[PDB]
Structures are given as structure tokens and as C-alpha cells.
């Protein structure tokens, strides 16, 4: 897998970012993570919901760098949605959001999953730490 560089253009929510990549732009999923919701009709603002999608987008917007990493499976949801790991300086946003409690690990697909275990040791440390939506 490759990182490759990128440029924020608006965060959407705690799992859905617009970036510049390769001079377009295009909207990114983060891969193999949930964060509550902030959209929907039926639903509304989920619990958390703000809270990841601040983080998401304080994370960005403070970044010297940003790269998308795109995983060995399918790069676009039937969407149209990039699927990627995201890093700001080095550090996994994906990640990141679930060591906070601010998001669950996905249901997985694979072979988009190299990420999996690593995501899901935060994931049960931040349930142990009893975070956010772990609490």
C-alpha cells in the first residue's frame, strides 16, 4: 500500500471528507470505521455525532500534511466515495478517531482490511477506557 498526497477542501462529517486529489476534487469514506451521524432525516444528530465530526475536521484543518492511503479492494463506494485511510502529519484520522471512542470499527469487507486488527486493539482499549460512545 501507498500513501499519496492530498488537500483538504471541507470536512462533512466525522467519516466524510472533500479533498483535492490528483487535481480534482473528490469526496473520501473513511474506511473501516463508523462515527455517529450528524445528517440524516430519520435519525438527525446522533449522540456524539458533533463531537466526531469536530474532531475530524480540527484534525484536518491542522495539518502540515495530509495523504490517503487506499486499501488493496475496490478505491469507490457505490457512491462514488473514495475508500481510504486518512493521515494527518503521520497520524491515521481512522485510527485516531477510534482510540477517542468517537467512532466503531465497520463492518469489513474484505480485502478492504489491512487495518483491521489495529483498529480494533483501539477500538477495545477505548472501551476499556470507557470513552465517548464507550460510556
Same mark, same amino acid.
Given at each position: +500500500?501507498? !500513501? %499519496?498526497?492530498?488537500?483538504?477542501?471541507?470536512?462533512?462529517?466525522?467519516?466524510?471528507?472533500? +479533498?483535492?486529489?490528483? *487535481?480534482?476534487?473528490?469526496?473520501?469514506? +473513511?474506511?473501516?470505521?463508523?462515527?455517529? %451521524?450528524?445528517?440524516?432525516?430519520?435519525? *438527525?444528530?446522533? =449522540?456524539?455525532?458533533?463531537?466526531? #465530526?469536530?474532531?475530524? !475536521? =480540527?484534525?484536518?484543518?491542522?495539518?502540515?500534511?495530509?495523504?490517503?492511503?487506499?486499501?488493496?479492494?475496490?478505491?469507490?463506494? =457505490?457512491?462514488?466515495?473514495?475508500?481510504?485511510? +486518512?493521515?494527518?502529519?503521520?497520524?491515521?484520522?481512522?485510527?485516531?478517531?477510534?482510540?477517542?471512542?468517537?467512532? &466503531?470499527?465497520?463492518?469489513?469487507? &474484505?480485502?478492504?482490511?489491512?487495518?483491521?486488527?489495529?483498529?480494533? &486493539? #483501539?477500538?477495545?482499549?477505548? =472501551?476499556?477506557? !470507557?470513552?465517548?460512545?464507550? #460510556?
Amino acid at each position: +500500500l501507498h !500513501k %499519496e498526497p492530498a488537500t483538504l477542501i471541507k470536512a462533512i462529517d466525522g467519516d466524510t471528507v472533500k +479533498l483535492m486529489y490528483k *487535481g480534482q476534487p473528490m469526496t473520501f469514506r +473513511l474506511l473501516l470505521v463508523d462515527t455517529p %451521524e450528524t445528517k440524516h432525516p430519520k435519525k *438527525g444528530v446522533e =449522540k456524539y455525532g458533533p463531537e466526531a #465530526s469536530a474532531f475530524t !475536521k =480540527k484534525m484536518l484543518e491542522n495539518a502540515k500534511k495530509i495523504e490517503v492511503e487506499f486499501d488493496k479492494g475496490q478505491r469507490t463506494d =457505490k457512491y462514488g466515495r473514495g475508500l481510504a485511510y +486518512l493521515y494527518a502529519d503521520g497520524k491515521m484520522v481512522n485510527e485516531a478517531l477510534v482510540r477517542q471512542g468517537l467512532a &466503531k470499527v465497520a463492518y469489513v469487507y &474484505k480485502p478492504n482490511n489491512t487495518h483491521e486488527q489495529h483498529l480494533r &486493539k #483501539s477500538e477495545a482499549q477505548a =472501551k476499556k477506557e !470507557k470513552l465517548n460512545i464507550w #460510556s
